[PDB]
Symmetry: D2
Subunit: 288 residues, 4 copies
């Protein structure tokens, strides 16, 4: 089982010097660094090439996360936005291929954060979304990428809030490259059972995000890690597990994540690295 961390645990914006984090994460022992997709369309082939070489040189595998903007919304009623959305993932998936990245995840079937002042048409968005994703999946297949649909809590999405919904949506899409992605932070709000959600995901589970109830590093909170380890084994999960802790206020990230108190308690970079490493030790011990 491969273990990673989202670079944003250290940064307040959806972009960073990924080569720097690739190096940090390697020294700390992770197998994976997960990066945000948004600066990738602004990279020259030269940059893509060197990011790839840097990760390869450091033994790090790269996975991608992405919170789509309203304009990249595959479920939109506006046919133009859906058109632009498809172009965006087509381009992006192509870059992922160049980067030798085989996994992308997040609210890929919608956009994030969601605007609730707006009027919600779930039934509508759900059908348009399923339709758009199947097309994109063609490209994903072609690019050797698993398109992972993350199940999110009610306050961050209205389309898919439980693993059962995720499975229904994926089955309905019905394409090899579209998987379900669960996240302990989100399962904690919506699920009747954590082990049950994993088991429901079953073979469809393609990626796993981890964090405590309030998004701290895995291990000293209330998440039922031992139960998760059991369930993952029950379903023979071989995928990767990426922690995505958010413990700092300020910035696009602090705001989007709604961190309104310093949950890190003044942690400095060295401190942050220490806890992430300890949490990585915990995860390998407990989850496998």
């Amino acid at each position: 089982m491969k273990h990673g961390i989202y670079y944003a645990y250290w940064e307040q914006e959806w972009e960073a010097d990924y080569k720097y984090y690739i190096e940090k994460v390697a020294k700390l022992g992770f197998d994976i660094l997960e990066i945000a997709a948004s600066p990738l369309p602004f990279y020259s082939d030269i940059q893509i090439n060197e990011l790839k070489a840097c990760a390869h040189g450091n033994g790090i595998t790269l996975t991608v996360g992405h919170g789509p903007s309203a304009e990249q919304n595959l479920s939109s009623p506006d046919p133009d936005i859906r058109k632009n959305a498809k172009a965006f993932y087509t381009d992006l998936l192509k870059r992922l291929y160049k980067l030798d990245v085989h996994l992308i995840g997040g609210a890929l079937y919608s956009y994030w954060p969601i605007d609730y002042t707006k009027t919600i048409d779930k039934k509508g968005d759900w059908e348009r979304s399923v339709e758009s994703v199947r097309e994109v999946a063609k490209v994903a297949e072609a690019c050797g990428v698993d398109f992972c649909l993350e199940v999110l809590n009610r306050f961050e999405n209205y389309l898919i809030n439980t693993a059962q919904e995720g499975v229904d949506f994926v089955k309905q899409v019905d394409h090899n490259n579209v998987k379900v992605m669960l996240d302990t932070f989100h399962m904690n709000i919506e699920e009747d059972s954590i082990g049950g959600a994993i088991r429901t995901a079953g073979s469809y589970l393609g990626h796993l995000h981890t964090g405590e109830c309030n998004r701290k590093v895995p291990g000293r909170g209330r998440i039922p890690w031992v139960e998760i380890g059991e369930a993952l084994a029950d379903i023979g999960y071989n995928g990767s597990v990426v922690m995505e802790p958010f413990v700092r206020m300020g910035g696009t990230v602090g705001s989007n994540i709604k961190v309104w108190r310093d949950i890190s308690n003044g942690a400095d970079e060295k401190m942050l690295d220490r806890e992430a490493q300890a949490a990585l030790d915990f995860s390998r011990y407990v989850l496998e």
Copy 2:
């Protein structure tokens, strides 16, 4: 210990025929019915008295919940809005006195739902609100009403997200009639420890909301009810416990609570009643004594 349920469990709007629910609730065995405050300002003294009369007749105690509108936002930098807010509350409080309800709770220090497409000024809203609430605290005291500030999760508010912040804020307000309020649904998100949060609230805890991780009635979910019960015994809690389940899509309630799937699983009113009563027995059994 006194147990109640919020009338919204059965309705999709922030008002309804309370007399109807008082009767249903007395029949299912609850001690309390919690009602939404919004319609109360438009009650004639006659209908206020009939409500109070209904409750007394059915042996039910009434408590009130309230999600403030932006215009009622006591923390708003706009002084006109603060004015409307404080005026609104004193009329409401005075009315509560007439209906002999001694408890109101909710994001009373802010507004709800919150508009997150706006820029957040926590420290600013925080000092304003503290000043605003202390002021309101006086009318609350004269009306014999406990003004409870409910700790909410990050997605529903940004001023008070943990019991520690609720206590800091209530100690700052520094007034006898202002209490911290906890909700198992909100604690499940923000707290390192449920039992620890209750012990942190301690003497200041004046009200408690219950619901499973996903807002189903208490009982078959992951919320740690026994730890809650033991922590309530640790502090010596003397308030009531109101379950606030939300399992239905639709209306302002469904959209305000973000119920995007049929969590009730097709329940008709009679099934909704069965489940509420069973959770009532569960709660009296698991949360008491220790």
Copy 3:
């Protein structure tokens, strides 16, 4: 599911006026009353028939538990003992048949409590037990009785301490009416996973005892009830669930169960009744899907 309670929750000896308890549990709403086997061998035909009629007239099903004496030890190396044991069970099972009882459970593959003053021979005891149980099974079968082997903690038995061991032992016996029986109080000690244990027992699970970690009535302690209910659902368990609370000091029961403090907090009979009933309500509410 069918829910019961063990009569000993109200008594300090391994026998009592079962009719009194049948009337009691029926009014409290239980489906089952579980009774101790020990006085049955001394029940005359009409006493047996009267107990049966009492159960039937009250909508109550009777189940049976037994802590075997050393003289009833089917795993004994002494062949005479094994012979006496087979004869004791044979007679008992025929009595259960007259009682219209179809389930007996406990450390039926050994004896209880164990004298840990004697040297253990697990392997030898295990093989003799498998043999003896095989032939007793044949008698139970003909009597219409499921023979349930209860998995116990290490301080009360050395042969079968985990659901996995109970499954191994039962597969070896290889008789359809012989089953694995789990108990929340014993799993709490020996199992890595509660739900895991239940899923391990699976189709072989034939009976379930409940109690908190310290044997208080189910619901207000640390036992993972919700996890248990989910796992029972996964294996499709539809059998019986008998709570076995022990909250009082004194007598053979207090001594055998090792209750060395008043866990009941001065509860009187009516107080004990109210608790059981609340626990029944809880069990029915939380354990079913």
Copy 4:
């Protein structure tokens, strides 16, 4: 806090080459090695000193555990036995002083394992034990040793089974060098609440043993480690945390601990080393601060 492991994790008899284990746990990274008191009485002053020196050299602190024999029973109604027991501990304590050991724990107020064959007289034994312990306490104070009374499950002792009973006994003894000692294995069986037991022990808590429900190394079982960490922080625990895993069949340890299956599942010495090391990391991580 300082973390340790009981040497018996690797041995099947209540004795062993302690020097060897001191060097083993130093390399594995532990702060402490806990050893059985049994062989200490047979130690020349030369032996004592090298052990003391071996510990000091590897930066390992030594703590002592002891399962008293019937002849060492301080609660015994036979005055000759109580006499011999005082003699035994007064000497053991003098030796501990020479080893610079500041802590000893186990069923020091009774004997272990107990013969549940005899007639148990809890009330009598309790009073005898209280008085005897208090006397021994004097010798402990003089030798600068903390006399830790471990609370055990009903199958292994009948005098003290819950932290509440432990605090009562200790408060009755009324002596500064007598502490309550808790063990996650035993609390898991007898306590309503784990965090609650720890808070109940509070300042009387002088030592803590850890292990999963079935005695594997801490970490992948059902013990509520976080709740424990949080409770220890609630009481500002000022002590050591020693893991006491028992995963091997055979010998007096296999028999006394009642290991009737290979819970280690084939582990060789290296494997055990690794698992204990992972458990250590787990423990410092999960149990610290909060």
